[PDB]
Design an enzyme around this catalytic site. Structure first.
Site, short mmCIF file in Angstrom:
data_model
loop_
_atom_site.label_atom_id
_atom_site.label_comp_id
_atom_site.label_asym_id
_atom_site.label_seq_id
_atom_site.Cartn_x
_atom_site.Cartn_y
_atom_site.Cartn_z
N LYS A 121 27.10 40.83 32.66
CA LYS A 121 26.51 42.12 32.32
C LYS A 121 24.99 41.97 32.25
CE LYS A 121 30.67 43.61 31.78
NZ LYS A 121 31.32 44.69 32.58
N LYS A 158 32.73 36.25 36.73
CA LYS A 158 33.02 37.16 37.84
C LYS A 158 31.94 38.21 38.04
CE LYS A 158 36.38 40.21 37.21
NZ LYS A 158 35.58 41.37 37.56
N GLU A 215 33.08 44.77 39.25
CA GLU A 215 33.78 45.37 40.37
C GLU A 215 32.83 46.15 41.29
OE1 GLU A 215 34.65 46.80 37.08
OE2 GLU A 215 32.97 48.11 37.46
N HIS A 224 40.84 43.15 41.45
CA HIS A 224 40.41 44.16 40.49
C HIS A 224 41.08 45.51 40.82
CE1 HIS A 224 37.75 46.74 38.11
NE2 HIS A 224 37.41 45.64 37.46
N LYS A 266 39.33 48.11 25.03
CA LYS A 266 38.68 49.42 25.15
C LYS A 266 39.37 50.39 26.13
CE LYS A 266 35.42 48.02 28.74
NZ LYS A 266 34.04 47.54 29.03
#
Lengths: 105, 467, 467, 105, 105, 105, 118
Positions: B167, B193, B196, B286, B326
């Site tokens: 992130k 990773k 996506e 994904h 989440k």
């Protein structure tokens, strides 16, 4: 403008149009599932659909099975569409009126 | 014989509602949940679904009589009302093996879900399950490697594997991307990773990321003495670009890549899964966009069908949800399709949403990946739910560790190793997970800081009622 | 500066709700319709959607401070309640141009609809519209040919084109397929087509169909003196197979092929659209599976977004619905996205569902294809709604003609030519369509038979109220 | 049950019947107000009452003002009564069916 | 088993747990949107959540804005989840009971 | 508002409070029936009432029969009252809020 | 046209020219060339629309005696799997051996979709 009478009469006309439209549905259903019975129902029904209650009662004597089917379909149709008719009729009239004034006046 | 051509509209149920049909073992079975429009009987609606997903259209055509319709038609063989719900039914429909192109998930979906969801006479339609016949399952490659071959390639045994999405999702340069990767991997995570939606963009072109990430993997693997990987995203605009990116990952000696199977599509995915098998690269899948399709229970396709389709098309990992994180995931449902993607034989069990018994004829299983909004306090529940054969992924739960990235990474790496050690010692991760974490927190300040941060509403309320 | 790293969970709306933001012309804008879970405020829900479709995750990460988050973050800049509906809002979100891979519909969708639809804090989410900035539109090829180049290639001017899906959907051999095709085309239809689920199957392998269909096209074109086509379905399990099938169609000199863009996927579709441009083959696009996604207005993606995406990815035709046929299509909505797929500049108009003004910077339009449950009585309405630049398709409405296939074909061919002649003469197809058809029915018995069959519930009721 | 087609067909039938009702109103008004003009409209309209929008465009060609009178009234009635029609037809049908299922079934 | 009293008392406990959970929600919201006010609310709230009505009234004096926010969130939470609690509590007790007998007895 | 987490947390709190209520019942019963056994349970339970399922497994270790008495009663109460709780908490909250918005706002 | 060749490469070279000439049908000796080459050829024939006639040269080395070997009906089944449009079945009445009852059996095995044990 006798509104209770007009509504009453409009409702009976509606009820008897929905009966006619339930007829069309089961006729089409039967066209797929039972072609000879579709033909019987079509021939039986020809010139009988003016009054929906009179129609169903005539059908009860010959084919109580089909009568009950139409009764259910008219009930179902009404439950799905009835709530949308006030807008459709009011705004349809208002748009149709106003299209007629635009074409001519 | 050919029974005479009578033109005109018939009811679908005259041809396609077959309540006395007993499905063959070569039949593909589908379970649909539907609500008919007012005035449309359930058996006609079920028959319409069977008709327009196999051989039929709205009016009678003479061409039927050139072939053997009984052999080819879809057959709605059972309808049942959904208990407790008005105007909702399950239709079970059998499709002959002959209707489907071998090895093509694209073709299967085109029939089963191609046109019927938009039918006027139906209010809502949701595909709940498909039984894939073993004879059809064998026409597919399935996972390039699958669970056991993957553990063997990576020398990873005895506990869940750990991953982490870098992130922010977008915005980092290639060099800063590899930096974050190195620091995560050196701290004890097995994988990092691409997000996506990290493909190739102005702020970070793909080939630069692949280059810098490969360097990060080598440095961290050399330091830790454990195999490291990073799912390099090869999701691309075209098949050609997809392959170009997969090829460079192989050139760099990268063990694993990722692909967004739904936004790229099954045709591109099946191409990639075959390439991965031929080139010995692991494939992480994904499920981006799945919730557009699978969230609401009145309309769409349930995820467990998409999971089955992915195992056929090919993938070594597939995101399964977390239940506790989440994003949404029903526990009973999840336990059901985790079995569908891992095991060889899964008995029908409606309490877990498995409508049909599914056999896989020794097609390898797919590793479930639990990801999204999870942190250290979730660990015992995750280990409890998914067991050892899973990947647990912490993006914000690693990079969001109060002291920054390197301590954040150490917190996750310590938490993981503590859990693997405990599991191997015979401790129950579900019952004892919190304790195992508290223990490790005693000697790891950076783990303690993370446990504190994401612990989370506690409740706690009260005693009065004294005599 | 980089404003200090404070680890921990913050509200999304602190970063991502920007009600004072004015979108740039290079921004990609999205309109979402959402219902938040009880207790989740609308602005936080809107901010969460913006966050998790651009740069953000569930907790604060230090890596944000390595880059310029203000430049990259999605920005929920407007929220409005849906008039008349409880707990339903529109969120308008702006995404910087930098977030997207050039020429990739796959990447765009991965961000906008990748993860946010499954967010626990949101009950339902539906993407209504996307404004594609002109700078992004120019990174795409778009239609291989588009409307005007297609008319020029086919020598087809002055009226809608006519097509027909062969039936039964599945079950016919290759030879019987070409037979049905020849008889349809010789009768006056411009096109026939494979059913969307006709790919390659035990009863009919693809290469055999291509062979026999090419023969049918040559014979019918020679007899009629008009250009004929048949959309040969190249939808395949893999990119390689797709291309192999496209290649043979070209080898046969076939003018047009078809592709199921959603069940195959955008990555394979974009590959095919580029190939079609380089090889001069027209591309018909079938929308199989779209209704899984676009039917319900509380959750999913509206078709008009899918139509926009397809025009970008590439297609010469795209099914648009009929409004009046067997599958659902709202008229106001349809008129809206027909404009979106045809025109160069479409003004915002919420009454037709167009949330944003869309420019296409001279990217060719896509022919709308009206198909499904339509027959001759629908013709004047179809011509009225879609106008000349459309393809009207009659599968059952051709092959279901009481006397069989050849008269069924003649009925459709006569009905079409009568409408084209009338249109060219200045007759209004909408107002006069029924009459034009009745006229032609006077001298065509086979058209008269068809008009009778599919006329359809009439109503008709009654006068009493006499003085 | 092509529900939007049925609703569309039902609204147009309600609009035609409400146009017939308005024509009855205007006619009764002109009965007090203008007996000649009443006699013209009563003879003009006999048998013409089929399609309400066709009737209106045809009455506009002869007497634009009187067509406008019927246009206003049809619309006034619709605004007053249409909202009561759903509940009347749904419960009407349910009550009429309930009677027959009781005696027969 | 004084059922009116037990229900009454269970309801008050529920009401005051939902208040506490609304607190957690706005605390988390504020953690994102207004970090210093989140801290104020957290520090203010510590050891005040036993009685939900007492809590909200204490909060009204200091921050009527936040009080009103919690009031809305507790109301929203209840409206979303309340209907599912009877099953969850009954079948939870029945499963928990029966798990305790299986482990021991 | 992680609604399934909140509901899950809420049900476990209801289950613990209903276990406390059952413990109060059993205690009052043993007040008539077995005063010693009552005194043992009252002193055993003081402060232990935190987690209802932990309390039960701990009471099973000492006196399996009495744990079973509390197990039955907690479950009896739940079956009798749980269905009334939704309407009580929703209207309870709405009424308590309505009071405060009236005086303050 | 016989494309039976020393190597896969030669086999394909010969199949290719037949296609170039627009020839509708070629032949292959599946046993003396082998199943690996045959399966390659059968796939090529499908992709190139050329019919494949299969000659059973050498089969009688394997299938003639009933005490040892493999019966032809197994070889026929294997060939239908590997790929061939024609396969020699024997004559019963001609110069080479063929048991009638047996022949009727494996003719059904190579033609039909479902063959009951008999």
């Amino acid at each position: 403008m006798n509104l209770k009478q007009i509504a009453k009469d409009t409702a009976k006309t509606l009820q008897s149009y929905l009966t006619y439209q339930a007829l069309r549905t089961v006729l089409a259903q039967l066209g797929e599932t039972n072609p000879p019975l579709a033909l019987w129902l079509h021939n039986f029904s020809a010139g009988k659909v003016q009054d929906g209650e009179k129609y169903i009662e005539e059908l009860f004597l010959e084919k109580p099975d089909l009568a009950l089917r139409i009764m259910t379909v008219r009930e179902h149709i009404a439950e799905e569409i009835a709530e949308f008719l006030p807008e459709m009729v009011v705004t349809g009239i208002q748009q149709a009126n106003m299209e007629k004034r635009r074409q001519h006046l | 014989s050919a029974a005479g051509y009578k033109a005109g509209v018939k009811d679908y149920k005259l041809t396609y509602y077959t309540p006395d049909y007993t499905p063959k073992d070569t039949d593909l079975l589908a379970a649909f949940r539907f609500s008919p429009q007012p005035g449309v009987p359930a058996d006609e609606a079920g028959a319409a679904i069977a008709a327009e997903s196999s051989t039929g259209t709205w009016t009678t055509v003479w061409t039927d009589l050139l072939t053997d319709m009984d052999r080819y038609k879809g057959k709605c063989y059972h309808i049942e009302p959904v208990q407790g719900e008005e105007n909702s039914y399950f239709a079970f429909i059998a499709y002959p093996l002959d209707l489907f192109e071998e090895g093509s998930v694209t073709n299967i979906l085109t029939s089963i879900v191609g046109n019927v969801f938009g039918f006027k006479a139906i209010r809502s339609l949701r595909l709940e399950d498909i039984r894939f016949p073993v004879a059809l399952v064998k026409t597919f490659q399935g996972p390039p490697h699958g669970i056991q071959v993957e553990r063997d390639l990576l020398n990873k045994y005895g506990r869940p594997m750990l991953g982490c999405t870098i992130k922010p999702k977008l915005g980092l340069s290639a060099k800063n991307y590899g930096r974050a990767v190195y620091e995560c991997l050196r701290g004890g995570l097995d994988f990092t990773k691409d997000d996506e939606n990290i493909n190739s963009q102005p702020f970070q072109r793909w080939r630069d990321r692949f280059l810098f990430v490969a360097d990060a993997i080598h440095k961290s693997q050399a330091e830790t003495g454990e195999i490291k990987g990073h799912y390099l995203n090869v999701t691309a605009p075209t098949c050609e670009e997809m392959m170009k990116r997969a090829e460079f990952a192989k050139e760099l000696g990268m063990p694993i890549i990722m692909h967004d199977f739904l936004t790229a599509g099954f045709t591109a995915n099946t191409t990639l899964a075959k390439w991965c098998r031929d080139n010995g690269v692991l494939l992480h899948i994904h499920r981006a966009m799945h919730a557009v399709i699978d969230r609401q229970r009145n309309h769409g396709i349930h995820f467990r069908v998409l999971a089955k389709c992915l195992r056929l098309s090919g993938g070594d990992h597939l995101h399964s949800g977390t239940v506790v994180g989440k994003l949404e995931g029903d526990k009973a449902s999840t336990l059901g399709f985790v079995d569908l993607m891992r095991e060889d034989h899964i008995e029908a069990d409606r309490s877990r949403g498995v409508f049909f018994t599914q056999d896989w004829a020794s097609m390898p299983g797919v590793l479930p990946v639990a990801s999204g909004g999870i942190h250290v306090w979730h660990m015992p529940a995750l280990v409890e739910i998914f067991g050892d054969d899973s990947v647990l992924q912490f993006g914000g739960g690693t990079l969001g560790h109060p002291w920054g990235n390197a301590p954040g990474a150490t917190a996750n790496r310590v938490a993981l190793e503590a859990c693997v050690q405990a599991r191997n010692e015979g401790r129950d991760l579900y019952r004892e997970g919190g304790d195992i974490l508290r223990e490790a927190g005693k000697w790891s300040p950076e783990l303690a800081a993370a446990l504190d941060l994401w612990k989370e509403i506690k409740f706690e309320f009260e005693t009065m009622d004294k005599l």
